[PDB]
Structure formats: structure tokens, C-alpha cells
Design an enzyme around this catalytic site. Structure first.
Site, PDB file in Angstrom:
ATOM      1  CG  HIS A   1      -0.210   0.091   2.457  1.00 37.75           C
ATOM      2  ND1 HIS A   1      -0.331   0.759   2.485  1.00 37.75           N
ATOM      3  CD2 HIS A   1      -0.884  -0.781   3.601  1.00 37.75           C
ATOM      4  CE1 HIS A   1       0.124   1.375   4.194  1.00 37.75           C
ATOM      5  NE2 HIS A   1      -0.252   0.011   4.683  1.00 37.75           N
TER       6      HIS A   1
ATOM      7  N   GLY B   1       2.834   5.561  10.892  1.00 38.19           N
ATOM      8  CA  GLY B   1       3.305   6.272  10.779  1.00 38.19           C
ATOM      9  C   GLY B   1       4.324   4.501  10.742  1.00 38.19           C
TER      10      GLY B   1
ATOM     11  CB  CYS C   1       2.018   1.118   7.401  1.00 35.40           C
ATOM     12  SG  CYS C   1       0.488   1.269   7.386  1.00 35.40           S
TER      13      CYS C   1
HETATM   14  O1  LIG Z   1      -1.009   1.645  13.607  1.00 35.66           O
HETATM   15  C1  LIG Z   1      -1.996   2.379  12.419  1.00 35.66           C
HETATM   16  C2  LIG Z   1      -1.226   2.505  10.831  1.00 35.66           C
HETATM   17  C3  LIG Z   1      -1.683   3.217  10.494  1.00 35.66           C
HETATM   18  C4  LIG Z   1      -2.682   2.711   9.180  1.00 35.66           C
HETATM   19  O2  LIG Z   1      -3.737   2.390   9.828  1.00 35.66           O
HETATM   20  N1  LIG Z   1      -2.550   2.870   7.969  1.00 35.66           N
HETATM   21  C5  LIG Z   1      -3.210   2.248   7.177  1.00 35.66           C
HETATM   22  C6  LIG Z   1      -3.080   3.962   5.687  1.00 35.66           C
HETATM   23  O3  LIG Z   1      -2.255   4.469   5.706  1.00 35.66           O
HETATM   24  N2  LIG Z   1      -3.897   3.137   4.159  1.00 35.66           N
HETATM   25  C7  LIG Z   1      -3.827   3.569   3.279  1.00 35.66           C
HETATM   26  C8  LIG Z   1      -4.075   4.908   3.213  1.00 35.66           C
HETATM   27  C9  LIG Z   1      -3.966   6.097   2.090  1.00 35.66           C
HETATM   28  C10 LIG Z   1      -3.087   5.311   1.258  1.00 35.66           C
HETATM   29  C11 LIG Z   1      -2.621   3.938   1.905  1.00 35.66           C
HETATM   30  C12 LIG Z   1      -2.693   3.843   2.501  1.00 35.66           C
HETATM   31  C13 LIG Z   1      -5.194   2.187   4.724  1.00 35.66           C
HETATM   32  C14 LIG Z   1      -6.356   1.930   4.340  1.00 35.66           C
HETATM   33  C15 LIG Z   1      -6.945   0.956   3.919  1.00 35.66           C
HETATM   34  C16 LIG Z   1      -6.200  -0.104   4.336  1.00 35.66           C
HETATM   35  C17 LIG Z   1      -4.445  -0.327   5.022  1.00 35.66           C
HETATM   36  C18 LIG Z   1      -4.575   0.937   4.509  1.00 35.66           C
HETATM   37  C19 LIG Z   1      -2.466   4.107  11.415  1.00 35.66           C
HETATM   38  C20 LIG Z   1      -3.323   5.580  11.682  1.00 35.66           C
HETATM   39  C21 LIG Z   1      -3.754   5.791  13.066  1.00 35.66           C
HETATM   40  C22 LIG Z   1      -3.933   5.269  13.243  1.00 35.66           C
HETATM   41  C23 LIG Z   1      -2.930   4.141  13.311  1.00 35.66           C
HETATM   42  C24 LIG Z   1      -2.171   3.174  12.751  1.00 35.66           C
END
Ligand code: A1IT2
Ligand code: A1IT2
EC number: 3.4.19.12
Lengths: 301, 306
Positions: free
Chosen positions: B41, B143, B145
Site C-alpha cells: 500500500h 507511521g 506500517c
Molecule cells: O496502526 C496504524 C497504522 C496506520 C494505518 O492504519 N494506516 C493505514 C493507511 O495508511 N492506509 C492507506 C491510506 C492511504 C494511502 C495508502 C494507505 C490503509 C487504508 C486502508 C487499508 C490499508 C491501509 C495508522 C493510522 C492511525 C492510527 C493508527 C495507525
């Protein structure tokens, strides 16, 4: 989101662990630059511990009597000396993996990571707090002696604990890295005991803040209190006093959540008197006191 | 004496963490030999995540569209490929700190250590379990991930988890290192949610054995139960069914302590039906299910890593 008992990564400390053998005893040591630090009781037999004269015991030892091994290599010991309850073995090689480091003496209430080791090798890492009665509640067996406790801040390891003994109650006692014990303990065989313990109030408040950051709210009430009135209740229930410094340290968590420090204290006050009502906070049914305000900020913001 | 939630030493893993940047996104990668593993991703913009066509996204990236950094040294990318939900960036040099390693897929109920990382820099390590519902109740911020979960087997790191996302209840989903998700999650913006979870019975029993080894014995009682009778009570309190396999793997702890497995089940039954009545076990006023039988033995017998 989440909230866990999180230890510092241990790799900078793993690169410093060695095994120190003197006669029939083996325990752990800490190799920084060209010094190995370990408990001075390594030089004692069981019979020596009844009434040791450490300066004389050490006069009857020579460099050759100390076997120091880093993994599979023996280090050459070229000098020895004692600082308080810590033995310092000079070796002819500076540890190439010496990190940036400092020795600090920590206050009760403060937390650190323990790297439990046996024979110079690691078993695991976990967080501990220095209790108000200067014990820690660790997980240690024979031969863990010389394992260390530490914090890591901007690439620099601050070592604050070296493990010396388990007490009859099953808790742990040791020194700073200058060899001064925390609390009223001694490295000889004598009746010694930890006093009564208290709960680290500022840590409990930091943990409540953590719970609020993660969405817990049920314990917030509509009341407030003063610092002096809160401290009267705390003393009844064996909680440490809360000081203005504590309040000040809790500022950042206060800012982030909107909850005034004295309002959170008013919440704790009701919890101390009335209990948790069968409810849980952040995965627990008791008030947790081994997270500092810095531990919470580090994980939650 | 003492019994802590103890993580693995993390040094072997700390030396493998790097940063990966594609467009405006930066997250963590795992650098083993000349490959960097990360969530795929990384190649998605927020626009793309509604319905990403990862093979179309990837074919449009050049090697030079990836910025991999070890510390502040650039690892030039010279190849890329996807395997399931993980991106594999081939780089121009082999990590000289690569430990001995294996990729393993774990089962629900098993435990591992997470090294939480941000911008390629480790911030801390904790021990957690794979929940029955294939999530982890981790501790992660934006951050994180690409952070990984692992076990150590003597001198070998078994990597089992790579972090991909937080679900809406605040629990965590991710993949094995071959990029297959644990559980029915997908790496796109969906309404996916964490299924119903249970408590890991065998692990609760394991920890009651730990408590006994440590001298905490007040919950031992004079009763017994059958396995079927036990499971009826397990069902009512949302605990996983106990199987004969589970009974078998509690064999060694039973032998060490002299407490028959079904007597310990009788003790847990009573704790479930009555609660703790004000008391604690190993410093907890709740029943803990993140220690496996082997985890108890390892900690209580002072197992070290090489
Ligand atoms: O524990 C974590 C890791 C972080 C997370 O969940 N990132 C997800 C994320 O960044 N995306 C994505 C979004 C926009 C472009 C590309 C990927 C996403 C979306 C759907 C499915 C899988 C990936 C996070 C954010 C807030 C609190 C806690 C946490
Ligand atoms: O957590 C620990 C560390 C280990 C321990 O307690 N070491 C102490 C120890 O060995 N001695 C000593 C004794 C005989 C000769 C020389 C030293 C000791 C005695 C008095 C004062 C200080 C040191 C241990 C043993 C069993 C279980 C758990 C644990």
C-alpha cells in the site's frame, strides 16, 4: 491506538553483555569501552558472604582469576578495582559496540527496561518501575545477577540498575552503575527486608490520561479538588503524595485531552474510595502505576 | 521468581529496519540480504485506496520512484515485485546485519514480539498474541506500517507479522512475510471489521500454572470437572473451547506443578463463575491470555538466545 507495556529496543544493550566467571561462580557483566562492570559478590563463596571483607577478598584475587567472555571470545583482564558494590574489570579491548551512554541514578516511581540475561546471553526484555520501597518486581533466576536496567533517549543509553539479589519476598534488589544500592540493602548474608510499599500516584494519573486518549471516559466525574485535599485521601490508601512538579509534568497530557489535572485527581480520589465498580481501564481491573507521564506521551501522541 | 510479559530481545530485528518512501508516503521496511520487504500500500495515494489495482499501480513505478534509506544512507532500488500484499524491493547491497531468519505463518492464540518502528527507527518492543479473530491488540500510531512481529528460535529470527493497518475498533491487521493477510482483511478502504473475539483458554490455564510455580496458589480448590462440562462454562463466558490437544500441551506444566489439567480447569471455572473476590494473580485482577504454555516454560527455565 492501543496501550502496551513497551520496553526500549534492547540491541544497544545486548552488544554490551558478557559473562564473568570467578572460580565456580558465573554471572553477567556490562562491557563499555574497556571496562566490564559486574556485582562485586562474584568474588565471594557462600561462606565468604557471612562476614566478607571485600577489600581483602579482592587483594587475594589477581587478574587471571577473572574469566571474561563476550560470546565466544575471552577478554584479557589487565586490571581490577571496586567502586562501592560494583567490580570494574579493565580489559585490553574497548567494546566496538559501545553505545552512546551515561550512568544515572533514578528516583522511585521511574521506569526502565530490564534485559534479563544468563551467561552473558539475553532471555528477554521487560519494563519495571523502581518501587517506593526501592525494590523492583522483575523476573529473575539464579545467574541473572549483573543484568541491567536502562532507558534510551535520542540514541543514548542511560543505565540505571544492575541486578544483585532476589529478596525472600520474591522481589529484586540492586545498585546503580556506580555501585550504590537502591534502598537499605547490602551484598552480604543478613536479614534484610523491604518495607511496606506505596502506589505511585503520578503514574496512576498518567495512565488515566492514557485511558482517556484511547477513548475511556466512564471514570471522569463532575467534581474537582485541591492538591491538599487529594493528598489527605491518598495517604489513607497508601498512595504517594502528589507534588506541584507532578502536576506540571502531567501538563502535556492535560493539554491533549482537555482534562484539568485537578479534575483527573478528583476522578482518582473517587476511585481510591469507591473502587472500579467491576469496570476496567485499558485492559485492567486495578489502577496501574508502572507508566510514567513520559511513557504515556511516548506511546500515545 | 517473578513473571513478566517479556518480549524477545530485539537487536537482530533492529538492524533490519529501514525507511521506504514512494511519493508523499513514508513507512517502514524490513531489509534482509538484498531485498526490502514492505506493505504494497506504499504505492497508493489516498485517492487510489477506494479500489486499488495494485498491478496497474506498480507497473507505473520505476525503481527510481522508490526511496529506501538505511539511517540516512540511500539503498538504490534495482528491481521490484509484489507477492500477495507485500512489496519486495531489490536493492544494490546486502544488509550486513541480516540475522539467520525464517518466515513463518503463526496460528491464532500464538504469541510474538512487535518492534514498533517509525521512519525506519525502532521506538519499542512488546509481546502480544494473535487473537482468535486474527487481529492483534497492538500499540501503533500513524507511521507504524511495516513494523514487524517475530519470535527467536535459538539464533534464528522467525518473522511472523508485518503491520498494515488499524481497523475502526482500534485493533491491528496485517500479513505474514509472504504477504498473506491474517484473517479476512484486505489492503483497501472497505467497511471490513474485526469479527467476534474469544479468550484463549489454553493460555489462561498456562498463566494459572505460572502463578502456581511462583507461589500464588489461592485459586486452587478441591473440585474437578470433565472437559465437556468445562466447555459448557467456557462457552457462556466467551472462552475458546478446550480440546484434548490443548490438554496435552499443558501436560508438562501439570507434571511440574502436580496439578492435574482438569483440576486447573476446575479452578478457572470457579474464577469465571465467582470472579476474583478482590484478589489478584501474578499482579493482575483479570485473567491473562497472552502467555502460551511454551512461553511459561521458556521464562521459568531461563532460556536464552545466541
Ligand atoms: O496502526 C496504524 C497504522 C496506520 C494505518 O492504519 N494506516 C493505514 C493507511 O495508511 N492506509 C492507506 C491510506 C492511504 C494511502 C495508502 C494507505 C490503509 C487504508 C486502508 C487499508 C490499508 C491501509 C495508522 C493510522 C492511525 C492510527 C493508527 C495507525
Ligand atoms: O534474582 C535472583 C538472582 C539470584 C540471587 O539472589 N543471587 C544472590 C547471590 O547469589 N548472593 C550470593 C550468595 C552466595 C555467594 C555469593 C553471593 C547474594 C546473597 C546475599 C546478598 C547478595 C548476594 C537468584 C537466585 C535464585 C532465585 C532468584 C535469583
Amino acid at each position: 491506538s492501543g496501550f502496551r507495556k513497551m520496553a526500549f529496543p534492547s540491541g544497544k544493550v545486548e552488544g554490551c553483555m558478557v559473562q564473568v566467571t570467578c572460580g565456580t561462580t558465573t554471572l553477567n557483566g556490562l562491557w563499555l569501552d574497556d571496562v566490564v562492570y559486574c556485582p562485586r559478590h562474584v568474588i565471594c563463596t557462600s561462606e565468604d558472604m557471612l562476614n566478607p571483607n571485600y577489600e581483602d577478598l579482592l587483594i587475594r584475587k589477581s587478574n587471571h582469576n577473572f574469566l571474561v567472555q563476550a560470546g565466544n571470545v575471552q577478554l584479557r583482564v589487565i586490571g581490577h578495582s571496586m567502586q562501592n558494590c560494583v567490580l570494574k574489570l579493565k580489559v585490553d579491548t574497548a567494546n566496538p559496540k559501545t553505545p552512546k551512554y551515561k550512568f544515572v541514578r533514578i528516583q522511585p516511581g521511574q521506569t526502565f527496561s530490564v534485559l534479563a540475561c544468563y551467561n552473558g546471553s539475553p532471555s528477554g526484555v521487560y519494563q519495571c518501575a523502581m518501587r517506593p520501597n526501592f525494590t523492583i518486581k522483575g523476573s529473575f533466576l539464579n545467574g541473572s545477577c549483573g543484568s541491567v536496567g536502562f532507558n534510551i533517549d535520542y540514541d543514548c543509553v542511560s543505565f540505571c540498575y544492575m541486578h544483585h539479589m532476589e529478596l525472600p519476598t520474591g522481589v529484586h534488589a540492586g545498585t546503580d552503575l556506580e555501585g550504590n544500592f537502591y534502598g537499605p540493602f547490602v551484598d552480604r548474608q543478613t536479614a534484610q527486608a523491604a518495607g511496606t510499599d506505596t502506589t505511585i500516584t503520578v503514574n496512576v494519573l498518567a495512565w488515566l490520561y492514557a485511558a482517556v486518549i484511547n477513548g475511556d471516559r466512564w471514570f471522569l466525574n463532575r467534581f474537582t479538588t485541591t492538591l491538599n485535599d487529594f493528598n489527605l485521601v491518598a495517604m489513607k490508601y497508601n498512595y504517594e503524595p502528589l507534588t506541584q512538579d507532578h502536576v506540571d509534568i502531567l501538563g502535556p497530557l492535560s493539554a491533549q485531552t482537555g482534562i484539568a489535572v485537578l479534575d483527573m485527581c478528583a476522578s482518582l480520589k473517587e476511585l481510591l474510595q469507591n473502587g472500579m465498580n467491576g469496570r476496567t481501564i485499558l485492559g485492567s481491573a486495578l489502577l496501574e502505576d508502572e507508566f510514567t507521564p513520559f511513557d504515556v506521551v511516548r506511546q500515545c501522541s
